[model samples]
Target: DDLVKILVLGPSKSGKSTVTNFLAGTRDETNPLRVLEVEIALKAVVQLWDVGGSWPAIASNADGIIYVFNPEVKGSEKELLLWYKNFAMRVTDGHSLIFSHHSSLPEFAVGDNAIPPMPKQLQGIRALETSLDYQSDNFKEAFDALVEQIIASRL
Candidate 1:
């Protein structure tokens, strides 16, 4: 069995838990660190750390990091990039910046060539977007791409 640890980090109310639930395919809402194990062909187990204020300590061991944030929220992009820089300094393996709550930001959009100019700190990092609609196909595809990225790295 291959065990993969993913650190899900973001500011309060940034849909970190929602992303975790979507990945884990569950609805349990709690503040503690959530561990979700799934057998994705290779028998990989994913530990989703959703506990607030815990990333700095556990980030060192994470296989990858999912930084979720909403672009519409005031100062959200700045804060998201700030954490992106911080984690990039520590975790060099790989990470993804996920923009959630798409409906809130009507001006911001997602597309194949819609990647914004990222800071030098996040040069090769992957980017994705999702909406409040958990059942949307776009949401499923984005997360599936994330998992594929993680799996590809290990291969």
Candidate 2:
């Protein structure tokens, strides 16, 4: 009898809307990107919300988050990584985060130095890695893992 509240958040045009569409099988039924607050229930049980990509607001309501990453764009990987670390530090224990990156790059690691290259070994964090070009069709496994993790965490 547990309900998982999954918040999908990311910067503009980072596929937040597209993911919402994929999850809900419709296009921004609640005008998620513009309205700043909207929720969609799909498959009779999954509740997905598009919180207008506001990092702070999304973190405030999220038990689990899915950060969409676009590799072709410069600085996305680094920005996404920073957001994850910050969110991880802000929330209490038991809150979960899922870094969903669409990058040909391998992984991301955090450091104070200049941005590192792709495929770098990311320590202490797990990311759902996929290519932006094909993430929608080829990334069900990542999505399933996220659902499983969220459910097991009792979120």
Encode model 1's per-residue lDDT on 1-155: one tens digit a residue. 66666776666677777667766777644465666654454366666666453345656656777776665566555566666666654674654645545545445544442333444655466665566643123655655555667777576
- Locate the minimum summed-lDDT window of 10 residues in model 1: 109-118
Q: Please give, for residues 8-116, the per-residue lDDT of candidate 2 as tens digits.
A: 6554455665665555556433344421222322321445666553345445545566666554466665566555556644552333333444434433322331223
Residue 137 CA displacement from its true place in model 2, Å: 6.3
- TM-score winner among the candidates? 1
- Give the TM-score of each candidate: 0.70, 0.56
Candidate 1 TM-score versus the reference: 0.70
Global lDDT for candidate 1?
Answer: 0.59
